[PDB]
Design a binder for this molecule. Structure first.
Ligand SMILES: Cc1cc2nc3c(=O)[nH]c(=O)nc-3n(C[C@H](O)[C@H](O)[C@H](O)COP(=O)(O)OP(=O)(O)OC[C@H]3O[C@@H](n4cnc5c(N)ncnc54)[C@H](O)[C@@H]3O)c2cc1C
Ligand SMILES: Nc1ccn([C@@H]2O[C@H](COP(=O)(O)OP(=O)(O)OC[C@H]3Oc4nc5nc(N)nc(O)c5nc4C(S)=C3S)[C@@H](O)[C@H]2O)c(=O)n1
Ligand SMILES: Nc1ccn([C@@H]2O[C@H](COP(=O)(O)OP(=O)(O)OC[C@H]3Oc4nc5nc(N)nc(O)c5nc4C(S)=C3S)[C@@H](O)[C@H]2O)c(=O)n1
Ligand SMILES: O=C(O)c1cccnc1
Ligand SMILES: O=C(O)c1cccnc1
Ligand code: MOS
Ligand code: MOS
Ligand code: FES
Ligand code: FES
Ligand code: FES
Ligand code: FES
Ligand SMILES: [Ca+2]
Ligand SMILES: [Mg+2]
Ligand SMILES: [Mg+2]
Ligand SMILES: [Se]
Lengths: 291, 330, 160, 420, 110, 53, 157
């Protein structure tokens, strides 16, 4: 393969220093390598400087706080799906993480890599978007946080997201599920392992004692450059109780917005339909959790 | 909603090249200690032909399987075995090994004979030439037989070749005798179709195959299990797409051309059916390709049964499921 | 491009090599260490044929750069044998009929072993999920799964 | 059922030990001293003549030992499992995407790729044919010879015109299957060299070494006894490794450099260049009486054999001989036409046209059973082949026929395991 | 010897020896026996192989008398009271008839 | 082959002897020389054993 | 003991290797360079089987220390072939019957080549003495000599 300089910093400080030094190359970070190594092997990426950050064990962590959950960028999907709290109370992330590639890919692949690749069909991407996550980006210049939605909308040294050439994502944060809140994820794909999502359906909600829906998040992973925001549908739920008939009432809305916003997608005619089958399952999931 | 259905698919498959000569050959040598070598060109590409020939040679020669050594697919020291295709090797190379063993047995039988009797004598069976033919007594071990063979200056070597007995087909009506033996199968499959997402889950499959007689039950079952899985993929996952601009295949990679993973495979109940009279080794016929065929029509039929409509085109993808379902409504 | 030094424990022994960093771990194992049991069936993480046990976990070596094996403990098929003899797991693949063409086998065995070293008595469901990263075009997985189940039972059997 | 000494027993395979121990060597696992690596420069257009080909810049790269085109072949340049319509290296014209035009041998895989990247070419593009409809239009360019019609078969048995008039039920439908790829887990790989005693040799992933040999010997103008083909432990084929893959390109580079030449294909190139299953469309009309007995079957089918014949001949006839299904049908007529197109080469894929045929005959049987309100298994047992049945080719079954047992055993098992 | 017995060019003959896995026992190379004993084994192996070549050739009027020798072509006992036939035409007829020419042979001094 | 197989108690078919290009024997190479000594060592070490007198 | 640097022209190309000096030139060629045509039949300079052309002159490599091949021009049997084909001398050895077991052949050819490269038209006696350093137990030397005489004649043209 293409020649290149290879660095493997032992601390976050050294990594930041390296990223800064070679920021104009620019540098190519490598974590699990499940995206990059292939991009390099197939010659889609031709780096001159590679910065391996796998030795930064400090970035591997899952800290469950009172109201937020902080996940280190180097956390593998295997570490994520195996975390008892994640597996128990944040179903959307659990299902997404447990369905990324295969165990081998899950053992190597990190959430930082997934979000940094920002693939149209990214399952970590879809789940974290559904949960309205926030990411922390650091460099020798300091640190900043931004909603994953803004991280995706922005454009840094690359268009896929706001990352700068000298930045390194260090952590992802999501709100911790309260007593009565729930999230669901459904991966629509061709086979039960090593499958690329056709629709990565994500849904999350909050309710206020009386059972009234207070917050709603409905995302169509893979039905847009970034997970399709079913805004109109969410707003239909906020302000009323959550029942199958109230959630299904949004179905024609999901249909219409997929056909409108996914107008130029090749399989729009199929997805505007299947997205309805997907969310119905999500409705079931959400409802059973709240009950 | 989820709808299940069951479908049946039966098939027929001629063994060997269609009305064309397509022989195979083999060489055999029995050593002084009752062990042996077998040489045949037939390529083993995972199906198990090398093992089959060994078991066949063992049975035919009456020696232990573990005592047989086999060499194949080397044009310098193994005779042409024809191509490993048309589910023909067990039949053709298999018979070629038997013939090879028979020639080699000529001297063995003559030396064994030299003990009162001749041809009529069931030589071979658990490492000993039994006088059996009316009196299983007056036995003799292979160790004892080779001793006699040596003392007589005789060696057990043989060469064999076989060609299915077939006729060419007339061009006007295709009349003639294309195959000397055919394999049969019936597979019943159960699936569950999601009417709203179009997902098709293959739950259970029962696949019965007429193999004449199995040379190795486990190997035959593997062919069937692999075949059923290849069938599932044929109908629900596998599809090469072609760029009609430059003619390039668009999805040549493993990530874009989908084959079943271990979590997709259904419960597979295989059934080995025997039939008599077959011209193959001990009456055995092919299953390599037969193992795949019936699964395909069964899965299709099963989806039709679950949905209540017809599907005459493969593959049947989620989009095709939804279109059919929507076409049943308004 | 400067060469790098990679220190790792390969198949039981501490190895050290100074080599160019621009190669995958798959290439390092196959070319520099001669472990041809590590297969390349796809080059994109899908087939699992290039699987090796990495710090206790099955990983696809075609998705990794050579330098990432630094400070690691790796076990390839060559390192499963016990004194040149088939381990129990290997003996089970031999007998269960889990082997047809044998190309996916190194990966299958390593993934199975990685599981058994962590959980000696897995449920059938756990065995399946654990090996879902290995594709096979010959067996239909049935007997490969049987081999692992048989190994688990015989292992328990050894309760003498 | 016959007390066999060893037959039927689940004996450990004679080749499983090397596979579980990791010592078994597949073609790509072979390496020799002074061995060179090889790659192929392939067409990126579907149908076209080569106006110019520059290999000078590729040859000038330090580390590249050879860059050859068809001019380097000393023997013949036409091959094929059945019909010799495939070149080793394109001479007259490109007929598909990925057509082999030139080969490179170099000290490292990177040098090979560098050599390929340095080769330039100019095509005079002809019309790429991708539909059987256009292929059959006689004004369309002929990919081979003077017509795109590759094979034609006609099976006439009894009298279907008369038969259909005696039927109580007739189901008619058009069936079609798609294009698939073998996807054996081991990509094509091979290595050639002259051994210690000067023997030209090729270790390769193949299903038919003896066939491979004849082709290599024919290319190098050598007797068959002087070309050794060794089938390495093969990681599956399913029909996709019957056609020549790397044997000739390697042997040719070895003949010229006298050194070992290793060629391992990327999964991508392996799929792009190897054969595929023939997509087919079958128009069928099946007739029977009220009791569900078959009286006549009529099929009119078409097959896309792609750019080269490969097993095209074997597929059209096998499919023609089996398309009525494993059933006694006193009247059958079959018309089959396979055509050449610039689509990927269609060849042998597990089944030789029968998988496609079964989709048809079984689809027909199930529609019959449903309409006559019969059990799908019963309608099949009723018409099933039995020793003595007369086949559509005039052949009478004399032995080894257990179709009815598969039918009964299958249903009995399904009743038990799936609630049939 | 093989070339003479078969009537083929010495240059077209390839041989392999002394490899227990694929070559049959040829006894020890001593007592000046090889040319005699292995030499006859070869001829006998050739004759068996010639059984299908002769049968195939003979299917052109004749049988035992044929003479499968000299410059790659199976002539006739006498000469040409019925023309000869080339090995090339013979091998094509062998193929068309689905026959292969293989043989095994052993010999032991009397 | 027989002798080696005997020494290791293996059936003849499981022991392969390859007569390499031989530089003369004249009778001095009919008896066993290094066959059993090499094989014996390869049997115990499982590695290739070369012996050149 | 420190490794020494050895520079030499082996079979037409400039090679250079750093290795321990505690070995014979024969070992260096066979082991370090893989030239196994150079045989070792006695280890005492008698058979000649280990003969190689050392600076236009044949020598017994079993009598030389690896380091002594420094700054020299060595040609072994592998270096005789012309672009992979048998030279005239080699062709003559083939047709003359000068080859039985072939263990002595490499040395014989190298000695005969060294001679012919200095004396194109040698006398049968000059040929004999020239190769008297190589022992053969198979041919009786007759046909080996004939091959050399054979080559010389074809050399005339
Ligand atoms: C066989 C296979 C199957 C797959 N299946 C799935 C699937 O089902 N779902 C899915 O979502 N994805 C899938 N993937 C893609 C991949 O596994 C994920 O995107 C993964 O999470 C990426 O993590 P990584 O650590 O490997 O990243 P890498 O490949 O190392 O890198 C990702 C990219 O982001 C950059 N980057 C990495 N870490 C950081 C950081 N912390 N800060 C800043 N930039 C950084 C890298 O420089 C690079 O450009 C698959 C890949 C393979 C090979
Ligand atoms: N009576 C029988 C018949 C078959 N068998 C088993 O099943 C195998 C298939 O035998 P057979 O049907 O005679 O077919 P071939 O040996 O000629 O194998 C080729 C066949 O094998 C198939 N199955 C395959 N299996 C593997 N693992 N890999 C391939 O590439 C395969 N390719 C396909 C295709 S396509 C073909 S044409 C045998 O080796 C044997 O182990 C048996 O035990 N007893
Ligand atoms: N009618 C004949 C007889 C012999 N030959 C030739 O002379 C050789 C000898 O043949 P034969 O007499 O049958 O003897 P073997 O082939 O069995 O050889 C063994 C014999 O060969 C002898 N000569 C030897 N020659 C060489 N080069 N090397 C040995 O080790 C030799 N050992 C000895 C001893 S001892 C013995 S026992 C054959 O290979 C042949 O090339 C021939 O062309 N025509
Ligand atoms: O190779 C052939 O010509 C062939 C193979 C199978 C069936 N019919 C023909
Ligand atoms: O050159 C040959 O024909 C040869 C060499 C060694 C063993 N068998 C044959
Ligand atoms: O190679 Mo399958 O007929
Ligand atoms: O080996 Mo000489 O009889
Ligand atoms: S080559 Fe690594 S997963 Fe396929
Ligand atoms: S046994 Fe062939 S791919 Fe698994
Ligand atoms: S080994 Fe040098 S002369 Fe004999
Ligand atoms: S030919 Fe044998 S020593 Fe000379
Ligand atoms: Ca000896
Ligand atoms: Mg082939
Ligand atoms: Mg074709
Ligand atoms: Se096939």
């Amino acid at each position: 393969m293409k020649d290149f300089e290879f660095f493997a910093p032992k601390t976050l400080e050294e990594a930041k220093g390296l990223l800064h030094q070679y920021k104009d190359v620019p540098p190519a970070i490598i974590a699990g390598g499940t995206d990059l190594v292939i991009e390099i092997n197939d010659r889609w990426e031709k780096p001159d400087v590679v910065i391996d950050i796998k030795k930064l064990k400090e970035l591997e962590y899952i800290r469950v706080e009172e109201n937020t959950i902080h996940i280190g960028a180097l956390s593998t999907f295997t570490q994520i799906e195996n975390h008892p709290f994640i597996r128990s109370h944040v179903r959307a992330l659990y299902k997404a993480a447990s369905q990324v590639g295969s165990p081998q890919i899950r053992n190597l692949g990190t959430i930082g890599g997934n979000l940094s690749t920002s693939s149209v069909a990214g399952d970590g991407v879809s789940a974290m978007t559904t949960l309205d996550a926030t990411v922390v980006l650091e460099s020798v210049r300091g640190t900043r946080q931004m909603k994953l939605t803004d991280f995706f909308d922005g454009e840094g040294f690359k268009r896929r997201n706001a990352l700068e050439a000298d930045e390194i994502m260090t952590e992802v944060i999501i709100d911790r599920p309260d007593a009565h809140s729930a999230s669901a994820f459904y991966k629509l794909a061709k086979r039960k392992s090593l499958a690329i999502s056709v629709i990565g359906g994500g849904m999350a909600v909050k309710v206020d004692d009386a059972g009234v829906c207070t917050w709603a998040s409905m995302r169509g992973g893979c039905i847009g450059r970034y997970p399709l925001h079913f805004k109109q549908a969410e707003e239909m739920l906020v302000g009323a109780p959550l029942t199958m008939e109230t959630m299904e009432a949004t179905l024609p809305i999901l249909h219409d917005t997929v056909y409108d916003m996914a107008r130029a997608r090749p399989s729009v005619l199929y997805k505007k339909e299947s997205v309805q089958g997907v969310f119905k399952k999500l409705f079931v999931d959400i409802l059973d959790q709240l009950e | 909603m989820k709808k299940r259905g069951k479908g049946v698919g039966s098939m027929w498959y001629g063994i060997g090249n269609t009305g064309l000569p397509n022989p195979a050959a083999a060489f055999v040598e029995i050593h002084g200690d009752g062990s042996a070598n077998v040489m045949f060109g037939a390529a083993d590409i995972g199906q198990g032909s090398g093992t089959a020939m060994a078991q066949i040679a063992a049975e035919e020669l009456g020696l232990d399987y573990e005592k047989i050594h086999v060499t194949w697919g080397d044009t310098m020291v193994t005779p042409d075995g024809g191509a490993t295709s048309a589910s023909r090797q067990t039949l053709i190379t298999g018979n070629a090994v038997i013939l090879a063993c028979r020639q080699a047995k000529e001297t063995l039988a003559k030396t064994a004979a030299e003990k009162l009797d001749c041809a009529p004598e069931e030589l071979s069976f658990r490492d000993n030439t039994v006088f059996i033919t009316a009196d299983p007594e007056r036995s003799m071990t292979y160790g004892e037989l080779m001793a006699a063979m040596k003392a007589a200056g005789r060696m057990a070597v043989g060469a064999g070749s076989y060609n299915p007995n077939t006729t060419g087909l007339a061009p006007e009506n295709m009349s003639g005798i294309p195959f000397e033996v055919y394999s049969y199968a019936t597979t019943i499959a159960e699936v569950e179709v999601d009417t709203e997402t179009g997902e098709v889950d293959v739950l259970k499959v029962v696949s019965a195959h007429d193999v004449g007689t199995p040379i190795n039950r486990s190997m035959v079952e593997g062919q069937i299990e692999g075949g059923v899985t290849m069938g599932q993929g044929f109908v629900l996952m596998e599809e090469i797409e072609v760029n009609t601009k430059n003619g390039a295949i668009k999805n040549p990679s493993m990530s874009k051309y989908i084959i079943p993973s271990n979590r997709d495979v259904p419960e597979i109940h295989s059934i080995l059916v025997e039939s008599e009279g077959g011209p193959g080794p001990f009456g055995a016929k092919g299953v390599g390709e037969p193992a795949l065929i019936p699964m395909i029509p069964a899965v299709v039929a099963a989806i039709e049964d679950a949905l209540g409509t017809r599907f005459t085109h493969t593959p049947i993808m989620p989009k095709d499921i939804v279109a059919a379902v929507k076409a049943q409504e308004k | 491009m400067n060469k790098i030094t990679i220190n790792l424990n390969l198949n039981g022994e501490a190895r050290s090599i100074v080599t160019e960093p621009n190669k995958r771990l798959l290439d390092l194992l196959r070319e520099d260490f001669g472990l041809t049991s590590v297969k390349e069936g796809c080059s994109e993480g899908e087939c699992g044929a290039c699987t090796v046990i990495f710090n206790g976990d099955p990983v696809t070596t075609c998705c990794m750069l050579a330098g990432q094996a630094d400070e690691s403990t790796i076990i390839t098929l060559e390192g499963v044998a016990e004194d040149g003899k088939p381990s129990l797991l290997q003996q089970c693949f031999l007998e269960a009929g889990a082997v047809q063409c044998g190309y996916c086998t190194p990966g299958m065995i390593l993934t199975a072993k990685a599981l058994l070293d962590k959980n000696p008595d897995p449920t059938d469901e756990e065995i399946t999920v654990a090996m879902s990263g290995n594709l096979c075009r010959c067996t239909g997985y049935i007997k490969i799964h049987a081999a692992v189940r048989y190994a688990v039972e015989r292992c328990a059997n050894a309760a003498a | 059922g016959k007390d066999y000494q060893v037959l039927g027993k689940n004996k450990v395979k004679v080749d499983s030990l090397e596979k579980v121990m990791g010592t078994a060597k597949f073609a790509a696992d072979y390496s020799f001293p002074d061995m060179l690596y090889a790659g192929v420069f392939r067409s990126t257009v579907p149908h076209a003549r080569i106006v110019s080909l520059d290999l000078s810049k590729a040859r000038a790269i330090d580390g590249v030992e050879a860059v050859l085109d068809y001019h380097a072949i000393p023997g013949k340049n036409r091959f094929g499992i059945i019909i010799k319509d495939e070149p080793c290296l394109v001479d007259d014209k490109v007929r598909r995407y990925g057509d082999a035009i030139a080969v490179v041998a170099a000290q490292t895989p990177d040098l090979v790729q560098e050599a390929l990247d340095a080769i330039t070419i100019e095509y005079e593009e002809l019309e790429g044919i991708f539909t059987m409809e256009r292929a059959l239009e006689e004004d369309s360019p002929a990919i081979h010879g003077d017509t795109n019609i590759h094979q034609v078969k006609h099976l006439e048995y009894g009298d279907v015109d008369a038969a259909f008039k005696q039927c109580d039920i007739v189901v008619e439908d058009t069936y079609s299957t798609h294009r698939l790829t073998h996807m054996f887990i081991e990509p094509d790989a091979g290595v050639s060299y002259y051994d210690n005693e000067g023997m030209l040799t090729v270790v390769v992933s193949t299903q038919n070494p003896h066939y491979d040999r004849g082709e290599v010997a024919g290319m190098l103008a050598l007797p068959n006894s002087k070309v050794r083909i060794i089938q390495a432990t093969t990681g599956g084929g399913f029909g996709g490794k019957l056609d020549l893959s790397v044997q000739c390109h390697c042997a040719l580079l070895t003949y010229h450099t006298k050194k070992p030449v290793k060629m391992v294909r990327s999964r991508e190139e392996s799929t792009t260049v190897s054969s595929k299953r023939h997509p087919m469309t079958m128009h069928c009309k099946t007739g029977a009486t009220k009791d569900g007995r078959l009286q006549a079957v009529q099929v009119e089918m078409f097959g896309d054999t792609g750019a080269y014949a490969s097993y095209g001949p074997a597929v059209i006839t096998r499919a023609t001989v089996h398309c009525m299904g494993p059933y006694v049908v006193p009247n059958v007529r079959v018309d089959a036409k396979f055509v050449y197109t610039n689509n990927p080469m269609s060849g042998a894929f597990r089944g030789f046209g029968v998988p496609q045929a079964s989709v048809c005959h079984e689809g027909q049987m199930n529609a019959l059973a449903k309409a006559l309100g019969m059990d799908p298994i019963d309608i099949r047992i009723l018409n099933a082949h039995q020793v003595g049945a007369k086949l559509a080719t005039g052949q009478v079954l004399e032995n080894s026929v257990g179709l009815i047992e598969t039918l009964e055993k299958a249903r009995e098992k399904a009743v038990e395991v799936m609630g049939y």
